[PDB]
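New to this. Please check this protein:
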Amino acid sequence: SEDCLGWASRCSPKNDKCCPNYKCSSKDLWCKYKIW
């Protein structure tokens, strides 16, 4: 039962539980894109 969050979701640097290939942004507390 591991449902990861999406890119347009909220998260924190202390507890980042977002799908892989991403990068939690502490700026807007949202999962940003790891690939540019």
About this structure: The two ends are 30 Å apart (CA to CA). Residues 24 and 31 are 4 Å apart (CA to CA). The first strand starts at residue 22 and ends at 25.
